[PDB]
């Protein structure tokens, strides 16, 4: 999948996790007022959305030592909102929400019916991820925390055509500095890396099937 982009051109590699969620059913989406049913793959359920972010917040936290300092994501990520550390890229459709819980769980609707909701933000941000304004009642961004635009087919697997609604798979992807020419910060993103294969090890969610993909 990353092994056809150079990974992240020639100076930054990806570390890549494929997630599923084998226990969750497809759902139906009923746009209002009228228009076609829209079905949702398993791992656009909500709640495992809300269980990936978890992961993804979890990730972004993962700390490792060399030598007595500490090394973070933040540390060896591309970040290419400023020059100094910041918001990492993360190529991945909690994104299109900021990945905040509550931008996840924004609705608006009446005593009963649903106007727009993470249904109506998704289909719209699948069509324009650069976007800062959903042209729904919503008037969410699209864009991600780290400044760039998410495009929909690298952070979702398994569906037809381009219905990204009808994914089957998320696709995660934190690009980090292969370091080339540093020896010592290498050492250091190394040392990371090693805390991350750990905590995707051992990671515990029945809901979730989280693999690293072949490069
Ligand atoms: C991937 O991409 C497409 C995303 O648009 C999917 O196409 C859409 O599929 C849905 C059905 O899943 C179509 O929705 C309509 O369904 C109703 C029937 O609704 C229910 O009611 C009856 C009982 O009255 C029940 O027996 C049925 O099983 C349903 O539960 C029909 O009345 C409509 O004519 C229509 O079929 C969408 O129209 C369709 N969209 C488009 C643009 O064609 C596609 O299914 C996905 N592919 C895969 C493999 O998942
Ligand atoms: C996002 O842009 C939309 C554009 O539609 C703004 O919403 C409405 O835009 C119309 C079109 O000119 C205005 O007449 C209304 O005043 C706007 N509605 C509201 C409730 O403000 C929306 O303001 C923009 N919001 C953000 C945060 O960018
Ligand atoms: C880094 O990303 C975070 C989101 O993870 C940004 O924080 C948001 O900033 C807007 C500014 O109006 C607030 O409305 C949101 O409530 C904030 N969200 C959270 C979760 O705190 C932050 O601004 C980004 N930093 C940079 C430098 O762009
Ligand atoms: C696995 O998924 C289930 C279902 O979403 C989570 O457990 C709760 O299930 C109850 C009963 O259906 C729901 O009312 C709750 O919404 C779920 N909990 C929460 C906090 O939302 C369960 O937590 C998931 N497992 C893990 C490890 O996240
Ligand atoms: C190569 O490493 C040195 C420090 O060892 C650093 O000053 C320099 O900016 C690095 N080169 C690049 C291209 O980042």
Redesign the pocket.
């Given at each position: 999948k990353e092994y056809f982009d150079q990974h992240f051109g020639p100076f930054f590699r990806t570390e890549q996790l494929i997630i599923r969620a084998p226990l969750t059913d497809?759902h139906?989406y009923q746009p209002y007022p009228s228009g076609?049913?829209?079905?949702f793959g398993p791992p656009l359920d909500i709640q495992i959305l809300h269980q990936v972010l978890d992961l993804q917040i979890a990730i972004e936290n993962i700390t490792a030592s060399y030598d007595n300092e500490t090394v973070t994501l933040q540390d060896i990520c591309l970040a290419p909102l400023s020059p100094y550390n910041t918001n990492c890229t993360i190529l991945s459709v909690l994104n299109y929400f900021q990945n905040s819980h509550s931008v996840l769980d924004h609705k608006k609707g009446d005593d009963f019916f649903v106007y727009a909701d993470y249904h109506t933000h998704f289909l719209y941000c699948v069509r324009a991820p650069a976007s800062l304004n959903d042209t729904s009642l919503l008037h969410d961004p699209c864009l991600g925390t780290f400044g760039g635009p998410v495009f929909p087919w690298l952070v979702l697997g398994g569906?037809?055509?381009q219905?990204y609604?009808?994914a089957t798979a998320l696709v995660i992807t934190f690009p980090v500095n292969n370091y080339y020419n540093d020896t010592e910060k290498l050492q250091r993103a190394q040392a990371w890396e090693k805390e991350f294969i750990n905590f995707v090890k051992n990671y515990k969610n029945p809901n979730l099937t989280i693999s690293f993909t072949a490069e």
């Open positions: 497809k139906i076609a049913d829209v079905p569906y037809d055509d219905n609604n009808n």
